Structure 1
Amino acid sequence: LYFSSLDSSIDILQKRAQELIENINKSRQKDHALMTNFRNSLKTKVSDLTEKLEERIYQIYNDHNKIIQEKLQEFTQKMAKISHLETELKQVC
């Protein structure tokens, strides 16, 4: 009578042990999924940051090229003006 009561205690203890091991397994699976998705979204966010850095650097380089092209065109026109002036002086002299 007493022995059967402690027998139910024994059954509950062993079965609690099995259920607890299964809970640990599910917890490990949940932790692994959380780890992998957080790592993935982190890498995606880093890719976005690299993308914006490249965008701003590209804008800087584009403005540099615009300035270089404008100054080169202005220099070429000044050179042409000097060439025409000097040809005129050649004619006169």
Structure 2
Amino acid sequence: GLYFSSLDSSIDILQKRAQELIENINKSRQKDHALMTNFRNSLKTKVSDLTEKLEERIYQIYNDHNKIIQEKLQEFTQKMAKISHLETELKQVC
């Protein structure tokens, strides 16, 4: 009567508490793999965007270093042209 029904009740609860706990594990590892993979693929795109910012700053160095040298040597050549011009002027008159 009372004894065998209250025992079947506690067992049926432990049946559900066992079934409910297994379902939560399958649902816990969902969020375990749905979040970490959303942080793994997230950190990959951030570090790659940090290097692309650095690789552009490095380009700014060599883009303006070549520009300064190309413009000075271009002026340096116009100077050596006007000097070789005047020396031949003095080698023919004298």
Query: Under TM normalisation by the shorter chain, which class is it?
Result: over 0.9
Q: What's the offset of the Cα at 1:28?
A: 0.6
Residue 53 of structure 1 corresponds to: 54
Residue 27 of structure 1 corresponds to: 28
Runs of 4+ off more than 4 Å: none
Q: What's the offset of the Cα at 1:86?
A: 1.4
Quick one: percent identity of the two aligned structures?
100
Q: Per-residue CA shift, 1:17-58, capped at 9, x if unaligned?
A: 111111011111211111111011101000110010011111
Q: Per-residue CA shift, 1:60-84, capped at 9, x if unaligned?
A: 1111111111121111111101111
- Any gaps of 5 or more consecutive residues in structure 2? none
Q: What's the offset of the Cα at 1:90?
A: 2.2
Q: What's the offset of the Cα at 1:9?
A: 0.9
- Any gaps of 5 or more consecutive residues in structure 1? none
Tell me the SS of whatever aligns to 1:40.
helix
